[PDB]
């Protein structure tokens, strides 16, 4: 089958196109014929070698994917060939205390597709039936593929970690990244008043159309005051920061006392600094968050089918232009998700 | 193999010994050679026909069980023949929203072993690897088999439903019967002051031995008054009831303002009238609870190995005497679990 | 000053106009010149004698009220004469554990204005500065007076008790009566899909205008079946009931598995028998709720100024017609609040 | 009256002994004749000038205090002369949304005694009746005084922020500090298995006697591994760090994935660094915590009266040796609290 793979751990030039045997489905497993694969930051991390070292090469990247059920292994129930589905990137054992508690993302054997094993940058992929979910009919394959990873991550942050509720002033940093665009929508869904920050008026323009109530350009090293102004001088109650590596000094200045700040986990190895004194004294909470319970995908897709949440496909390129896709992310030039059309 | 089948629905006499073929473990399944099967009131409802209608016959009852791993399916890890284990009676599909969230006991396809599928009243039983936990080595097989079902039910009521915490006055109804044995111990484990009620002086004496700080006899028409007197006149904060529909009026009377009452399988007789406006005006909360999440069996067994929680085996009977065992249980005379010894 | 005193306990005719001396504000107290006093079912229980026995006479009823600051005690800040305000009907000692925890409505000395102390059925009333909130400027005095009592009760039931969240199917009983008006709006505010039930077509039509997504008529012996049909057959997840003791059997039937039912002042007639084992087997939860924490009045009024929540004034009557007002309320005919105009 | 005051903002030499007019009680206020005053870190901070700048000098330090009610102002209820009491250092307005919600420590007007106004380093002090609590009879004045501030702070951290429960492995850093000794006890009370760290075997010896299950000396730059070893290799689930400025790099290495770490707020202005990448990726939560709801003191004292919690008075000196007391803290030479006998 056709697939993009990485011969080495370098820049986007390491991603090449080759042929690999079509994987076969095992018991309780399912083979999917991919129609679309979404790019994720996790991809670039592994591609550089900052994540998942000593990984078997060549490697097939890709955590987000959508398509049609090609074949089911022995003992499979709930899926058949021809069925449209989207992948749920969370691979867990399903036996440990964490999994049985609905916390598979905390499983000691937790693995994201394309991180440890071959992902969605191919025409085919096999995975446990439990990791497959029906694709909504009102969406295109590309749109479907862009949902899972970022929506899951933004859901844990906004709902479970920040406990967002109506009345809350939510600050979403760097509107434009996959996590951001979903966090803005989910936060609105929970009655929040969203304030989104970005580095260009163009991204702010898009954040506004996405549902943001107020927007702030952090190009000006005084944006925290603006955020304070927009929130009656008290600052944001809850903050969604998909990185923490962007003017975090300001973020905390924009955050209300007792405020909560959620930071989307990443294997970027980024070493920075976190203000102790004037952070814990103001009783601020800084919560690391990564992916989310696989159970979150069902209600997320439902809201997407109802139209309350929408995927944000900024660009689509052919699977073979995977390299070009990575440069689009590394150069941060697209508002929303980057999707690869497969087949 | 030897097994106690259910020829037809009716009195305990319908339970007879028969020879059934040995079940074979599927892909992710394992066959356990049973040593002890604990008796639950659920087995009685199935026997009488009150539960699980349209149930094929013959049927093997039994939700609780302990034993040794006999054989394991092809693709199965974490279990080998010889391993001592106890059964996690909760069966679900592990693919729906409820299951992925850990709330398997709320799965639309949720099933308790022995309720619809052959249970533990045999020398062998086959279940998914997800429903098997290591048997604590400090316990006898009859003690181990007695844990699961009641400890899980008592745990959801005390920990999740009632949110028992140190300083709480917890009231447990009818000691020695149902989930009281486990509820008194879990309650204390969470820092509460337990007040237990029973009918005989023996059971109350038995209650204190389990950790009950105070005892009350509900054979008197004014026992609710003693509970009030025993808690500074305010009444109990949290209440664990598995009988109800008889003393419920007394419980409601014994419950302090804003108190919480957790009800297990209170399928008693008449429902009188239930003095409402008493539960509303005083902001009381009545919570129904059946079983618990499979994940809860891990902390339980851990506390059991430490000796902070322990099962109470009231009587042991040979497997071929399941009938006599159902009699003992139906008359609620024995203090503790009735356990069948298989092999 | 003019006031409607309660000469004796009995029918609404016991309410008569009398001249009482003007109360004087203590140290941290303030005297409010009332403009409107909203009528609550509580005023009726006090009038009949069913509530607050040993109550000195004459007594001035009235828990809800709005007006202008008249005079303030010596040591008081944050209030000046001329300021428009609404009353927070919750009176507590503010020194006990319950009060310091915010749960003032659970204070052992908790008292609702007008229940034991002179209320709002007069031209002036004196209460602690802690029980006064700024009146939203976008509302008329009768609209303002209608908010507090019902919005606080509906909020604790929806937000704290039921934990309503987006995607939830909330069922509100008897629209236009009690806390339904507020519950339908708060429910929607928290992202639920509201199904409202009423007796007349007018009230149901009125319900949808308030945000009710679906409507059902409980005049039919099978209305519970419509709620089930209206929620994918599963039933309502959360239920707000302020009547009970009459349709409660229907509610329980309309409640989905593991559902929660919040009950306000369901002090209806007979209690029939209440089909238990249905609330236990299906793990249902019945929660009693009276009033709410004073702190909750702040977010409520904020949403009211934004227009996300709005009071519904059913009828206005001059203060001297409190008697006629109690009739209108006792017959549960008027849709919305019955508000007395003082000055 | 005799009292210790600070003429300037320098070392412990600025604390002098002088005479100041005896403060008079106002409405709803109470004058206390101090018998003992406990030293707190907050004291040294303000004494140096790192906290509460532009504060009126001379200033009377002291947040913790116990003694006898000297006189009550007009309109006081609940207290009379001769009554033994301990101070609740949290001064809040009692009107803002935070206060009425039981979150007075989050009030915008929150002030700790001795931080903004004259504290307990005198023979007399006046404060709102709401800030006074009855001293348990089984305790000496010195012992009583050492409870409030640190126990309150350790309570919010352990119970509210870390949500400690039985089964949890709690890591308490720097056993010896006021917060630590209380955190160890409260954590045990909630069923935790406590691991305490310190720099000398002597403090570890005392932490063991206090209730710590396991102890680790962080003098050895490899202690995190030891903590991991003691917790089956998974690390601590919850961590109490009353500073964060002590081997925080190790703390996070000793913390289990998904773990929670509570840091006691301080106006030390300590600027350090917080590991981003490998912290949020492991889904760690870092929670700033300061003081606690005044409501927490009641249940805390109760547990002290029951004997479940005990104050830890490491040393007592005469009020006039306040300077010496501060050097004992600045030189960190005492396990537990330092108390000043007054009068
Ligand atoms: Zn797992
Ligand atoms: Zn399921
Ligand atoms: Zn109170
Ligand atoms: Zn305040």
How many Å apart are CA C202 and CA C26, to the nearest integer?
A: 48
Least CA distance to B303: which residue of chain D? D167
- A107 in the same domain as A122: yes
Q: Which residues of D line the annotated binding site for Zn(2+)?
A: 93, 96, 99, 107
Instruction: Go through D69-95 and write b for each residue having 16 or more CB atoms within 10 A of its CB, e for each that does not.
Output: bbbbbeebeebeeebbbbbbbbbbbbb
Top residue of B104, B160, B276 to mutate, by most chain C CBs within 10 Å, is: B276
Check CB contact of A234 with chain C, cutoff 8 Å.
Answer: no
Helices C297-306, C148-155: inter-axial angle, 10-degree rounding: 110
State CA B4 to chain mean position distance: 21
**D chain contacts of residue B185, beta-carbon cutoff 8 Å:** none
Tokens (6 digits) for D41: 């870190």
Same domain, A277 and A302: no
Residue ranges of alpha helices (H) inside chain B are: 41-48, 97-100, 141-146, 148-155, 180-189, 201-210, 223-230, 248-254, 278-281, 297-306, 322-330
Separation CA A53–CA A57 (nearest Å)? 10
**Residues D135 and D217 grouped into a single domain:** no
Among C275, C228, C207, CA closest to C247: C275
Name which of D27, D99, D294 is nearest C75 (Cβ-Cβ): D27
Q: Which of D3, D234, D264, D9 is nearest to D153 (CA)?
A: D264
Subunits close to D (at least 3 CB pairs below 8 A):
A, B, C
Indicate whether C282 and C301 sit together in one domain: no
Residue C300's closest chain D neighbor by CA? Answer: D97
* C-alpha dihedral sign at D154, D158, D159, D160: positive
Distance of CA A136 to the CA centre of its chain: 19
Phi, psi of B255 (to 5 degrees): -85, 130
As a whole number of angstroms, the distance between CA A96 and CA A108 comes to 8
Report the 3 state secondary structure along chain C. Answer: CEEEEECCCCCHHHEEEEECCCCCCCCCEEEEEEEEEECCHHHHHHHHCCCCCCCCCCCECCCEEEEEEEEECCCCCCCCCCCEEEECCEECCCCCHHHHCCCHHHCCCCEECCCCCCCCCECEEEEEHHHEEECCCCCCHHHHHHCHHHHHHHHHHHHHHCCCCCCCEEEECCCCCCCHHHHHHHHHHCCCEEEEEECCHHHHHHHHHHCCCEEEECCCCCHHHHHHHHCCCCCEEEEEECCCCCCHHHHHHHEEEEEEEEECCCCCCCCCCCCCCHHHHCCCEEEECCCCCHHHHHHHHHHHHHCCCCCCEEEEEEHHHHHHHHHHHHCCCCCCEEEEECC
For residue D167, give both structure tokens.
């089964």
Answer for the pair B284, B241: CB distance below 8 angstroms, yes or no: no
Rounded to 10 degrees, the C-alpha dihedral C138/C139/C141/C145 comes to -130
With CA atoms as reference, report the closest residue to A341 among A7, A39, A6: A39
In angstroms, the CA B340 to CA B316 distance is 6
Contact C38, C121 (CB under 8 A): no
Resolution given for this structure, in angstroms: 2.3
Q: Please, are residues D311 and D149 in contact by the beta-carbon 8 Å criterion?
A: no
Strands (E), B82-168: 84-87, 90-91, 111-112, 124-128, 132-134
| Torsion angle in degrees (nearest 10) through CA of B180, B33, A29, A304 | -10
Tokens of C328: 């209108």
Residues C250 and C301 grouped into a single domain: no
Is residue A144 a known part of a binding site? no
**Are residues D143 and D171 both part of a single domain?**
no
Q: At what angle do helices C148-155 and C180-189 cross, to 10 degrees?
A: 50
DSSP state of A157: I
What length does chain A have? Answer: 343
**Cα dihedral A109, A115, A120, A123 in deg (nearest 10):** -100
Could you tell me the two tokens for D201? 């075997």
CA angle, residues B306, B308, B311, in degrees to nearest 5: 100
User: Within 10 Å of residue A81's Cβ, how many Cβ atoms?
Assistant: 12
CB neighbourhood size of B333 (10 A): 13
Residues 273-302 of B with CB under 8 A from C: 273-277, 279-290
Q: Are residue D65 and residue D154 in the same domain, yes or no?
A: no
Contact criterion met (CB below 8 Å) for C104 and C90: yes
Q: B111: exposed, middle or buried (C-beta count within 10 Å: 0-12, 13-18, 19+)?
A: middle
Q: How many residues does chain B have?
A: 343
The answer to whether residues C123 and C152 touch, using CB atoms and an 8 Å cutoff, is no
Pairwise CA distance, residues C300 & C134, whole Å: 12
CATH number at residue A270: 3.40.50.720
Tokens of C247: 């349709």
Q: Give me the CATH number covering residue A80.
A: 3.90.180.10
Of D272, D276, D281, the CB nearest to A245: D276
Same domain, B132 and B152: no
Residues C192 and C313 in one domain: no
CB of B179 within 8 A of CB of B290?
Answer: no
Q: Which two tokens stand for residue B208?
A: 């204190």
Torsion of CA D144, D150, D151, D152, to 10 degrees: 110
Do residue B118 and residue B184 come from a single domain?
no
Rounded to 10°, the helix D41-48/D322-330 angle is 100
Query: B82 CA to middle of ligand 1, Å?
Result: 23
Helix H or strand E segment including B261: strand B255-263
Q: How many structural domains comprise chain C?
A: 2
Are A130 and A22 within 8 A, CB to CB? no
The set of chains that have 3 or more CB pairs under 8 A with C is A, B, D
Residue D294 and residue C94: Cβ atoms within 8 Å?
A: no
Alpha-carbon distance C146 to C141, whole Å?
A: 9
Classify residue B300 by its DSSP letter.
H
Please state at what angle helix B297-306 crosses helix B148-155, rounded to 10 degrees.
110
Does the beta carbon of A79 lie under 8 angstroms from any beta carbon of chain C? Answer: no
Residue with tokens 């003098």: D219
Solved using: X-ray
Last residue in a domain, options D249, D273, D290: D290
- Domain membership of residue C235 as a residue range: 148-290
Nearest CA in chain D to B168: D299
Q: Is B167 on the interface with D (CB under 8 A)?
A: yes
Domain co-membership, B134 together with B1: yes
Residue in A294, A316, A302, A296 with CA at minimum distance from that of residue A136? A302
Chain B residues near residue C106 by CB distance under 8 angstroms: 257-258, 283
Residue C262 shares a structural domain with residue C327: no
Residue A54 contacts by C-beta under 8 Å, 6 or more apart in sequence?
none
Contacts of residue C233, defined as CB under 8 A and 6 or more positions apart, other chains included, come to none
> Which of B285, B288, B293 is the best mutation test for C, with the most CBs of C within 10 A?
B288
Quote the CA–CA distance of D165 and D159 in Å, as a whole number.
8
B108 contact A CB<8A: no
């Amino acid at each position: 089958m056709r697939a993009v793979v990485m011969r080495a751990r370098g820049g986007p030039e390491v991603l090449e196109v080759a042929d690999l045997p079509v994987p076969e489905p095992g018991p309780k497993e399912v083979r999917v014929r991919l129609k679309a694969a979404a790019l994720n930051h996790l991809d670039v991390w592994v591609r550089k070698g900052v994540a998942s070292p000593k990984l078997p090469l060549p490697h097939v990247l890709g955590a987000d994917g959508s398509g049609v059920v090609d074949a089911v292994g022995p003992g499979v129930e709930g899926f058949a060939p021809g069925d449209e589905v989207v992948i749920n990137p969370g691979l867990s054992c399903g036996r440990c205390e964490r999994c049985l508690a609905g916390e598979d993302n905390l499983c000691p054997r937790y693995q994201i597709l394309g991180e440890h094993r071959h992902g969605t940058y191919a025409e085919y992929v096999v995975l446990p039936e439990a990791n497959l979910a029906p694709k909504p009919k009102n969406l295109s394959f590309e749109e479907a593929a862009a949902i899972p990873l970022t929506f899951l991550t933004a859901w844990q942050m906004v709902v479970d970690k920040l406990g967002v509720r109506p009345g809350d002033d939510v600050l979403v940093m760097a509107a434009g990244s996959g996590v951001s665009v979903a966090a803005i929508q989910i936060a609105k869904l929970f009655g929040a008043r969203v304030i989104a920050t970005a580095g260009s008026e163009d991204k702010l323009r898009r954040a506004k159309a996405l549902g943001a109530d107020e927007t702030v350009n952090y190009t000006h090293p005084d944006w925290p005051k603006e955020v304070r102004r927009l929130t009656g001088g008290k600052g944001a109650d809850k903050v969604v920061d998909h990185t923490g590596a962007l003017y975090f000094e300001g973020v905390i200045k924009a955050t209300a006392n007792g405020g909560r700040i959620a930071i989307a986990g990443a294997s970027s190895g980024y070493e920075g600094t976190l203000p102790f004194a004037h952070v814990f004294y103001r009783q601020l909470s800084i919560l690391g968050s990564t992916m989310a319970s696989k159970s979150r995908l069902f209600p997320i897709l439902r809201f997407v089918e109802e139209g309350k949440l929408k995927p944000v496909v900024g660009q689509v390129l052919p699977l073979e232009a995977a390299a070009e896709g990575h440069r689009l992310l590394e150069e941060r030039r697209v508002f929303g998700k980057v999707v690869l059309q497969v087949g």
